[PDB]
Amino acid sequence: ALPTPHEIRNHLDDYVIGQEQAKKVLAVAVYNHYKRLRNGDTSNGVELGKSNILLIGPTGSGKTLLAETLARLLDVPFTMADATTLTEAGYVGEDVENIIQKLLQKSDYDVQKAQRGIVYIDQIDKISRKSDNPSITRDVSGEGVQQALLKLIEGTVAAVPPQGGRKHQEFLQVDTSKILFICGGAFAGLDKVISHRVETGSGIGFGATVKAKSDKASEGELLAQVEPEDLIKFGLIPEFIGRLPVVATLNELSEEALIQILKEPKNALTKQYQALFNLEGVDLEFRDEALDAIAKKAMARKTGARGLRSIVEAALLDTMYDLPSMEDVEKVVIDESVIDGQSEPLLIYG
Amino acid sequence: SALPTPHEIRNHLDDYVIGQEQAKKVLAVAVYNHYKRLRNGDTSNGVELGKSNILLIGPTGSGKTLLAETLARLLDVPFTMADATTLTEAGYVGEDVENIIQKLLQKSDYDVQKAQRGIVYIDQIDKISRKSDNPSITRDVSGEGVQQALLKLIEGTVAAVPPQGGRQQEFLQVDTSKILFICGGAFAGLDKVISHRVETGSGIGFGATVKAKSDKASEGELLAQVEPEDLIKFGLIPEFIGRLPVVATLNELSEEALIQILKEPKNALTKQYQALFNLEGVDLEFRDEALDAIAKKAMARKTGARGLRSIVEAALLDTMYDLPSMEDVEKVVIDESVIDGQSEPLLIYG
Amino acid sequence: XXXXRXXX
Ligand SMILES: Nc1ncnc2c1ncn2[C@@H]1O[C@H](COP(=O)(O)OP(=O)(O)OP(O)(O)=S)[C@@H](O)[C@H]1O
Ligand SMILES: Nc1ncnc2c1ncn2[C@@H]1O[C@H](COP(=O)(O)OP(=O)(O)OP(O)(O)=S)[C@@H](O)[C@H]1O
């Protein structure tokens, strides 16, 4: 039979931690995509609507991770394109149509199986207009990209070179009214725009309020209050946002979340390094006293989960540089002190 | 199938580099661990093995570009040195990010399976660090935009490269999740931003302490205290730094280190001139008294090892100009006075 | 084909 939101969410939890609201949106969309296509031409409520998804969150939150993990369990075709390389009006870079062409490579040129596929885009913020007002001069990597996607998302015919071609004499028609699009990107600087709109203080006098330094505009609580009008001041056009009604607000990694990300997931960094030394005939250990200490260092970097290797590799630099030369080494232990740099990791010999 | 060890490869780089013990350890661990991730053929329990790029930072002429060059000699896997000054945001006339890949295939003989396990090096990365406030007024084609494009290139993607530029209208897909990147560029002005974070005070008031020159920060030590948040003020994006967790800080040249550079390395400038006159049938000598004077003159120039030839060639100009015309000259001696310019270099007659 | 000409 078909899957369910509880079953699909249980799978994503194995690879993703600390994202409750984000998993709910993707589960309903995927669970609803099978319903729309299955009911196509068989339900009296013809011309079923569509609802794309627009993910938003800080860096290292798991946006690109969800698209990869989703393809593992997803049956229908899936792709991972990028907005940065697209170019409007057939310029030097690739065109919008190239997105559909990549889908056929994974679908084996199955048009009937390609129309029911899913599409994902990363780094959507790169095409945002730098200024709120429309640019006076033409743009090749901004607003124009949004314009070309309008007819694509809603639904339009497309040209795809079947084999051994770039441009014009064989074109395969593929509708796009039923194709799903999952756009995502960490919009930088959006916190400043929402503060002007939400705080509204903008004053120095007695009556005006002066928020106490460092106890305001928490990124997690600020993105939750986002609205489409906020994105207009960022640079996006309202016509583009109208094509993506659904919006998902993620949260920044909690200190407790980082401890779980290194233990509960299967692809955690702790398990990765453990396998790196497993082939070397050497074990590894990571006590809880060291994990909680690493969380404070990571959050200070404000880079996300991806800024964790700098704390680990900087500590195990000396150890890894000398471990291969050493012999009769069966186990390595890294206590909390090693992380601070005031001690050296203990070694166990056979 | 016995692979090299960090101690063995470090001995090779030590022959060509001096006083970079901190930087050599990072390259050794990365190159060592790069073969381990390559050795695996999906026969291990660990999945989605992590990657760890490197970010080299150092003063001018400290030897950053030299480490990558000598590394490629002893390296079996391919290697490249792609200039980043000419990189432009994809979608524009000047350049594309794809060009880097095409270079890698020329070295690997268009071996996709062999190119994916290659190494990549980038120089002059500070050239694209935009120093400005949020750029609402204009969009930069070489600054912030280029860095965003690189994000897709790293952490895993599929690109398009012509088959040697095209004799077809077809491209080859090459993953880059396993490809390592070593970005490096002397960040000018990074000391001023770090000083504000570490000095903590202006000191125009009665209570505030003032140590203008007694406690003035040392440039060498200061770079050791760098962090990702410091780079955000410089112009780098957090998304870009997260892809490069490891960081390598290099120390400035010292009077003692400069003397070793002229004697221990095989490619030293002293040995270069020794061979220049060997073809002419004349011997060359360099006493220790002259080396100590050259070190003091080079440090004042604030240029590093690259600013040493100006001290040598400016002194031996007159001597080289009339050396071929002279006959029966078999040996030349350069005294400390020669560097000062008070006297002339003694000549020997056979 | 397409000319990207811009001046600061
Ligand atoms: N929720 C999470 N649980 C576990 N690991 C995570 C999570 N989010 C991020 N990570 C780690 O961070 C790595 C990168 O995650 P990404 O999805 O690339 O983050 P990101 O926000 O998509 O980065 P962008 O979109 O390019 S700014 C993953 O490979 C994981 O190791
Ligand atoms: N440790 C060293 N030992 C010997 N010669 C060195 C050393 N470091 C630098 N040099 C000399 O400096 C030359 C250039 O070194 P580079 O690697 O270009 O320095 P750099 O830090 O890369 O400067 P940038 O980054 O290109 S501005 C080399 O060809 C050597 O002649």
Side-chain angles (χ1 to χ4, degrees), chain A residues 33 37 76-77 111-118 178-180:
Chain A
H33 198 246
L37 184 72
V76 309
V111 167
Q112 298 294 337
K113 199 170 185 179
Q115 296 167 346
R116 67 200 72 191
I118 312 301
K178 315 307 194 186
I179 293 167
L180 187 63

Side-chain angles (χ1 to χ4, degrees), chain A residues 12-19 57-68 120 122-123 125 184-187 250-251 253 257-258 260-262 265 267-269 272 303-307 309, chain B residues 48 151-152 154-155 238-240 243:
Chain A
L12 300 169
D13 185 73
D14 305 332
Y15 296 81
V16 168
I17 305 292
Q19 295 285 14
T59 301
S61 315
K63 310 192 304 291
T64 312
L65 174 52
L66 282 160
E68 189 172 356
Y120 174 85
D122 193 355
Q123 295 168 32
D125 68 333
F187 292 97
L250 271 56
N251 311 325
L253 298 163
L258 293 161
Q260 300 181 9
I261 288 158
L262 297 168
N267 311 128
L269 296 171
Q272 286 169 16
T303 307
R306 214 182 289 91
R309 293 183 176 80
Chain B
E48 188 251 1
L151 299 170
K152 283 304 315 193
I154 309 154
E155 209 65 21
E239 298 174 8
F240 186 72
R243 316 282 168 164

Side-chain angles (χ1 to χ4, degrees), chain B residues 16-18 59 61-66 124 261 305-306:
Chain B
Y16 296 83
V17 174
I18 304 292
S62 177
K64 300 198 305 293
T65 314
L66 181 56
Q124 278 68 54
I261 287 163
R306 216 180 283 93

Side-chain angles (χ1 to χ4, degrees), chain A residues 103-119:
Chain A
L103 187 62
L104 306 197
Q105 303 301 128
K106 300 181 172 59
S107 192
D108 316 327
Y109 308 107
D110 294 334
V111 167
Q112 298 294 337
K113 199 170 185 179
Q115 296 167 346
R116 67 200 72 191
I118 312 301
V119 184

